[PDB]
């Protein structure tokens, strides 16, 4: 039986659009360039796969003849993206697929569905997270992951599961992001850790969270992470991603427990100022932060390109300090706090600083120090830059 079915334009176009993002560009095996359509029992299944990441979504469908077909993914995406808002009639006829919408008519050559690899079966679903919380946490941590495939061991997000607690981490050796959150476990309690490619996980957080809840699949019991695969399911969309076989550093030990100095200031203000003074820095060379008497003196630049400085009111408690940072790394941290005010926790100009959201307890603390580190769900440790 050849596939004959009618679908809604927006449904088919959205599904194809999403499944098409995971498609490989000019893959080794030609069939990998195709999208798989399988219609049955008043539904259509649209799938893509590249041996590293898989995307599968199911949409409503008026089935006239259940069947399966494989068509060029990018071409299907371009076509579906330009169809008029009318029903989409899909009908496989021999070696070609007939796609009809409005007065437009397309006839494409099918692909070798037999040569197409079987999709990976997702492990057992371990737990479920609110979609917005998951998206925020991942977005907050991923900024700290490495972005260089020549250093793959840095390009991951560590996912720790301990009962109802989940800890996400990421680093590139110069900055560390950690987010603690709670989820609803769907299996007996687990105590496992894996390393997921950050780009794929963030992609799933942005484009994969179609619903309000997000189920994650890593296994069950002792076989959590054994399959080397992570499943991510939502309302209709389910994807898979290969795990990274690399060790994540020990980060709990680098998180300071006390701070000699502390500086609270507004995120928007600080961000704008950093981006302004950084205009004269030598390609994100460094920004100099001079804290003293509740005033933050920002400066940067050389005498050959130019130098800039700007003063900002700041709630600074502790010993005066002069510490420098990479502008991009700094604004990356500030942009992940998602709070009105940021609180820095400095030690020495040559040791990490703790950017974290401001808490009510910080307005209170004021003295000579030392000050104890506050408990916070998200933390962004940033290594400073050596000054001349």
């Amino acid at each position: 039986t050849d596939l004959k079915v009618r679908l809604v334009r927006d449904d088919f176009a959205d599904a194809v659009a999403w499944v098409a993002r995971s498609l490989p560009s000019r893959p080794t095996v030609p069939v990998l360039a195709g999208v798989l359509l399988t219609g049955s029992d008043d539904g259509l299944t649209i799938s893509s796969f590249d041996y590293e990441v898989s995307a599968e979504v199911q949409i409503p469908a008026e089935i006239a003849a259940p069947g399966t077909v494989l068509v060029s993914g990018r071409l299907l995406s371009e076509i579906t993206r330009a169809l008029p808002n009318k029903p989409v009639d899909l009908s496989v006829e021999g070696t070609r697929v007939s796609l009809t919408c409005g007065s437009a008519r397309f006839s494409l050559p099918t692909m070798a569905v037999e040569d197409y690899p079987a999709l990976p079966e997702l492990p057992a679903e371990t737990g479920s997270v609110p979609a917005d919380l998951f998206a925020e946490a991942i977005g907050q941590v991923a900024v700290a992951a490495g972005r260089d495939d020549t250093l793959p061991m840095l390009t991951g997000i560590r996912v720790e599961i301990s009962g109802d607690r989940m800890v996400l981490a990421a680093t590139d050796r110069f900055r560390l992001a950690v987010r603690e959150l709670t989820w609803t476990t769907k299996t007996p309690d687990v105590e496992a850790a894996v390393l997921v490619p950050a780009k794929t996980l963030a992609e799933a957080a942005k484009t994969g969270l179609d619903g309000s809840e997000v189920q994650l699949a890593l296994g069950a019991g002792p076989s959590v992470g054994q399959d080397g695969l992570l499943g991510i399911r939502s309302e209709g969309k389910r994807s898979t991603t290969r795990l990274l076989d690399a060790e994540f550093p020990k980060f709990r030990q680098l998180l300071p427990t006390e701070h000699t100095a502390m500086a609270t200031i507004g995120v928007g203000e600080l961000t704008e100022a950093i981006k302004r003074v950084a205009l004269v820095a030598d390609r994100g060379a460094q920004v100099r932060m001079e804290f003293a008497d509740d005033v933050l003196h920002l400066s940067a630049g050389a005498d050959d390109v130019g130098r800039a400085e700007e003063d900002l009111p700041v709630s600074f408690s502790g010993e005066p300090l002069t510490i420098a940072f990479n502008p991009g790394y700094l604004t990356d941290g500030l942009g992940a706090l998602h709070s009105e005010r940021v609180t820095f926790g400095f030690t020495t100009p040559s040791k990490p600083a703790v950017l974290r959201p401001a808490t009510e307890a910080d307005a209170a603390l004021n003295g000579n120090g030392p000050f104890p580190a506050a408990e916070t769900d998200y933390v962004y440790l940033l290594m400073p830059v050596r000054l001349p």
Partner: peptide, 6 residues
């Protein structure tokens, strides 16, 4: 630029 780990 210093590093957190190696």
């Amino acid at each position: 630029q210093e590093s957190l780990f190696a």
